[PDB]
Each structure stands twice: as structure tokens, then as C-alpha cells.
Amino acid sequence: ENRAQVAARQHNRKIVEQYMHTRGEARLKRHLLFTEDGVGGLWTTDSGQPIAIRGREKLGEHAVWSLQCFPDWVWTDIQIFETQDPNWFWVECRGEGAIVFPGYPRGQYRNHFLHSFRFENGLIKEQREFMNPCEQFRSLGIEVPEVRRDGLPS
Amino acid sequence: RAQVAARQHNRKIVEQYMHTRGEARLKRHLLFTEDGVGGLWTTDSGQPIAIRGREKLGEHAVWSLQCFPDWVWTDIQIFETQDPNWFWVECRGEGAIVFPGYPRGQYRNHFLHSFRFENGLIKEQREFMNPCEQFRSLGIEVPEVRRDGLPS
Ligand SMILES: O=C(c1ccc(Cl)cc1)c1c(-c2ccc(O)cc2)sc2ccccc12
Ligand SMILES: O=C(c1ccc(Cl)cc1)c1c(-c2ccc(O)cc2)sc2ccccc12
Numbered sequence: 001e002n003r004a005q006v007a008a009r010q011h012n013r014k015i016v017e018q019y020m021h022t023r024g025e026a027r028l029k030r031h032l033l034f035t036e037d038g039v040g041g042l043w044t045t046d047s048g049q050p051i052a053i054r055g056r057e058k059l060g061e062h063a064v065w066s067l068q069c070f071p072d073w074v075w076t077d078i079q080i081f082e083t084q085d086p087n088w089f090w091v092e093c094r095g096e097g098a099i100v101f102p103g104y105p106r107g108q109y110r111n112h113f114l115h116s117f118r119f120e121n122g123l124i125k126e127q128r129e130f131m132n133p134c135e136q137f138r139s140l141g142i143e144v145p146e147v148r149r150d151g152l153p154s
Numbered sequence: 155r156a157q158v159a160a161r162q163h164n165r166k167i168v169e170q171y172m173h174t175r176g177e178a179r180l181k182r183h184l185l186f187t188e189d190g191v192g193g194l195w196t197t198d199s200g201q202p203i204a205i206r207g208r209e210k211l212g213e214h215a216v217w218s219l220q221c222f223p224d225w226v227w228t229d230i231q232i233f234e235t236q237d238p239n240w241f242w243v244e245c246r247g248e249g250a251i252v253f254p255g256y257p258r259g260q261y262r263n264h265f266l267h268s269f270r271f272e273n274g275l276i277k278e279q280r281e282f283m284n285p286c287e288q289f290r291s292l293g294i295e296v297p298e299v300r301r302d303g304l305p306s
Binding site (some may be wrong): 043044045046047048062065081082083084085088090092101102103104111114116130132133134135136137138140142143144145146147148150151152153 | 287
């Protein structure tokens with residue numbers, strides 16, 4: 001049993017590494033790292049609800065959009081965490097690139113990210129991304145509200 | 155042996171931290187090293203708000219019990235890692251928010267916590283969430299990214 005779990009964790013780690021280092025035109029094939037019904041997307045949004053892309057095929061189609069709106073995106077400072085579940089990994093990293101959203105000025109986006117990767121049979125079943133949307137607001141020229149700090153300890 | 159022993163003890167401390175509620179929050183700083191750091195890494199400013207030192211952490215807990223008087227963490231999932239001294243926690247949290255100068259409200263959010271250990275106690279705790287939900291709980295307007303040109 002431990003041999004099978006050990007093997008799964010070593011294999012899944014290699015897929016996480018591959019995912020995190022995928023840049024440029026290779027992003028068009030990142031969806032092959034997922035199960036046929038795998039889900040990926042952004043769990044921290046302006047609205048409160050995740051924006052998730054469901055299915056390997058739709059993930060490949062979303063990649064076409066991503067190469068237009070995040071044309072040169074890179075993940076940096078990658079730290080991969082194995083867990084007691086051989087099929088569950090977390091990643092702490094940063095990310096950076098141009099942001100080219102419709103109807104907004106071209107900007108430069110930088111942020112800190114946490115990723116969750118859950119695996120089934122050697123491929124990604126669920127990827128979720130967590131960040132602070134305030135930095136994406138700033139990259140688009142959108143005003144970020146401020147919590148008044150006068151009454152807080154300081 | 156040395157790594158295994160550390161991880162089992164450290165997991166107990168993470169569990170204790172995440173289940174500390176009510177007046178026991180006033181003693182939660184005793185789970186940290188003398189120079190331990192805790193705080194919020196996802197803010198409105200872009201910089202962390204970190205509380206530095208076990209003594210300042212205990213002082214901050216007094217403020218926290220006033221402003222989050224009934225706070226609980228829920229849906230707690232603790233992740234050990236290949237570092238026996240590094241743990242991650244996925245959870246939710248909820249309770250009243252009583253912030254200076256804002257209407258009393260109810261705050262609910264999803265959280266990730268990072269716990270790094272030194273010699274049996276927490277050296278660094280970091281909390282990550284979506285500040286837009288805290289804005290909502292305070293009655294602060296959340297900006298909206300225009301979707302019109304985005305796939306839907
Ligand atoms: O970057 C993103 C985003 C969301 C989900 C994914 Cl999978 C990737 C980027 C965001 C939006 C988006 C929605 C639909 C769409 O097809 C493309 C982008 S809307 C919004 C709002 C706030 C923060 C981030 C985003
Ligand atoms: O809840 C918090 C917060 C920040 C740090 C900790 Cl340790 C706990 C709560 C926030 C602020 C705060 C700053 C100083 C202070 O002594 C008390 C609160 S300012 C702000 C801004 C946006 C989101 C959350 C917070």
C-alpha cells in the first residue's frame with residue numbers, strides 16, 4: 001500500500017512541476033495534464049463565487065483566451081508542498097505578466113498565489129487558484145477601497 | 155526519527171490553534187515562539203499586517219475579542235507537508251464583525267493558513283483570504299471588473 005502511495009505522490013509531484021513551469025505556447029497543451037472531467041480556475045474573485053472551467057476540452061479552449069489576455073504570464077518563486085494525501089498538493093508562488101483585458105488599458109499584473117491540486121489516476125482532477133483580487137484591480141486601474149484605520153490599533 | 159517526531163507534535167499545536175475559541179483566545183499567543191509572527195497576508199493595501207512577538211500577539215488578541223467577539227473556524231482541513239515544521243490549513247471562518255467606525259455586521263470567508271514551527275512552537279502564522287468578502291461585511295462597495303468582453 002505504501003509503495004503505491006509513494007509512487008503516486010512522486011508521479012503527481014512531477015505533474016505539478018510541469019504545470020507550474022508551463023509558459024508560452026506550451027500553455028495551449030496544459031489541459032492535457034487534467035482528467036477528461038477535470039476542473040480548474042480562480043477561487044478568489046470580485047463577486048465571491050469561483051470562476052471555474054469544467055472539463056478538459058473547455059480548459060483547452062480557455063487557454064486560447066488566456067494567451068491573449070495574459071500573453072507572457074510566468075509563475076515564479078515556486079514552492080511545492082506534498083501532503084499526507086498522495087493525491088493532494090499545495091503550491092505557494094508568485095506570478096507576473098502583462099494583463100490585456102477588453103476595455104481596460106494594458107497593464108502589468110503581479111500577485112502572490114496559492115494553488116490546490118487534487119489528482120485522480122495520475123492526472124489533475126481539480127486545480128484551484130487563490131489570490132488577493134485587490135492587486136488585479138490595481139493592475140487594471142480600478143480603485144481599491146480602503147478600510148479606515150483610525151480606530152484600529154497601530 | 156527526528157522529523158517524524160516533530161510533525162506529530164506540531165500537528166497537535168495546529169489543531170489547538172484552530173480550535174481556540176472564546177476567552178481561550180487570550181492565551182493563544184502561548185503557542186508561539188518568543189519572537190513568533192502572526193497576521194493577515196491579504197489586505198487592502200497590498201502589504202501584510204503582521205503582529206511581531208509573542209507579547210504583541212497577546213495584546214492583539216484583546217482587540218480581536220472585541221472586534222470579532224464570537225469568531226469560529228469551521229470546515230478545518232489540516233495538511234502536513236514534507237517539511238515536518240510546515241503545515242497548511244484550509245478552512246472557513248465566521249462571526250460578527252464589530253470594526254471601529256463601521257456598522258456591526260456578519261463576516262464569513264474562506265481561509266488558507268500557513269504554520270511554520272521552531273522547537274515545538276509556531277514561529278510564523280500567515281492567513282490568506284479574499285478581502286472583497288470583508289469589504290462586503292463592512293458595507294464597503296466592492297469594485298466589479300467589466301465582464302462584457304470576457305468569455306461567458
Ligand atoms: O482573471 C480572471 C480569471 C477568471 C477565471 C480564470 Cl479560469 C482565469 C482568469 C477574472 C475574470 C474572468 C472571467 C471570465 C473569463 O472568461 C476570463 C476572466 S473576471 C475577474 C474579476 C476579478 C478578478 C479576476 C477576474
Ligand atoms: O481585519 C484586519 C486584520 C488585520 C490583521 C490581523 Cl492580525 C487581524 C485582522 C484588517 C485590518 C487591521 C489592521 C490593524 C489592526 O490592528 C486590526 C485590523 S485593516 C484591514 C483591511 C482589509 C482587510 C482586513 C483588515
